[PDB]
A paper describes a structure:
The Dz36/substrate complexes assemble into a “V” shape with two arms (P1 and P2) orientated ~70° with respect to each other in all the three structures. Unexpectedly, the catalytic core forms a compact small DNA pseudoknot consisting of two short duplexes (P3 and P4) perpendicular to each other.
The DNAzyme/native DNA complex without Pb2+ adopts the same space group as DNAzyme-Pb2+; as indicated by the very low value (0.307 Å) of the root mean square deviations (rmsd), the overall conformations of these two complexes are virtually identical. These structural similarities indicate that the Pb2+-binding site is pre-organized and that the Pb2+ binding does not induce local and global conformational changes of this DNA catalyst. Compared to the real substrate, the G−1 residue of the native DNA lacks one hydroxyl group (O2′) at the 2′ position.
Residue numbers in the entry:
A (entry chain B), B (entry chain A): 1 to 174
The structure:
DNA sequence: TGTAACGCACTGCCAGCGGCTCGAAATCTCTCTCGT
DNA sequence: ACGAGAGAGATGGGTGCGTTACA
């Protein structure tokens, strides 16, 4: 278990210490393409895990980034790993804290943040509401029939207002 | 053999009693998606078999519907059975009668109905007409040089008229 | 005119490198448990 | 509401004939 302040710290320590192994090449992860999500982004007092979203530019990389992820100077086991979700246990200041990692591509970014910020109940209200208008929403995008609806948006705020919903900051989503 | 009357009785009996097994689930076939075809849709006095065209929504389901087909409370053996055609022998009022089932995916429905309605001598006239115009028509769609000619059509009638042919009632095709 | 189910011969190509079996080795689905 | 990872369960060589059978 953690506190908000500690989690923010850990998030700061990792922005600049991220890289994955690709054809024997250790490629850096720009902090520009790392977004914190989960109970942390919803400025909660007490945490459980830390969740970060990693943005991947090129489709072909997905198989390489999460399974072969590297962190400078930190001890970390691994519980499960896929291309899209990863669960690590790290040691920080001599203690064990769960860390969760996720992955989205450029045009998935707004949908991805909005999905992973949450919280659940808020997602559930939203997705149900658009289900009654024949849409499906997920972390990938908006879909009407099979075909994914292309939306002229770029930011999460932009996306929410496009989905015709009051925009609230993350710590007021229920 | 069967009287047309006995045939209508059977189809009607069957409409609300068709289901298949799919992952240990017994899935009800909607009478909405059960078309009667062959000699019975052509309203012949004397029938030899009973022909049922079943409409399957999701292509993935073809390998489950027909091979795991069940009929609530009616004896039947199975002569042959595959994904697309399946041949039964049922006990009805202490007599053995042959029942055929065929399948069609939603977007084939017009061609299928048209196909299975028959009769053969009619289809030949028709297919041979579209052949000399470099087409092939079959239960699955219309083709030109191995390429599916898409048509915005949704009924057997629309299809026939789109094909440029005088619509005849099923009982008047020869 | 146009297609399906099925049993089969002839291979082709892996588990088996000789067999055309049973059931290996690798790949699928589904089911479960998990996330937000 | 809508997806993921990881086991479990299940498949079991491709062709292409020829024959019977469907409208």
């Amino acid at each position: 278990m953690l506190t908000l302040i500690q989690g923010k710290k850990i998030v700061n320590h990792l922005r600049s210490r991220l890289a994955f192994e690709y054809n024997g090449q250790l490629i850096k992860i720009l902090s520009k393409n790392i977004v914190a999500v989960g109970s942390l982004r919803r400025e909660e007092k007490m945490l459980n895990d830390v969740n970060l979203l990693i943005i991947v530019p090129e489709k072909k990389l997905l198989k390489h980034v999460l399974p072969n992820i590297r962190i400078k100077g930190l001890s970390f086991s691994v519980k499960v790993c896929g291309e899209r979700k990863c669960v690590l246990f790290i040691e920080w200041e001599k203690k064990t804290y769960q860390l969760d990692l996720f992955t989205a591509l450029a045009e998935e970014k707004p949908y991805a943040i909005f999905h992973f910020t949450g919280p659940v109940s808020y997602l559930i209200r939203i997705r149900a509401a658009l289900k009654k208008k024949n849409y499906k929403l997920n972390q990938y995008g908006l879909f009407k029939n099979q075909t994914l609806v292309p939306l002229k948006i770029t930011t999460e705020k932009e996306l929410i207002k496009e989905l015709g919903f009051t925009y609230r900051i993350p710590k007021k989503r229920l």
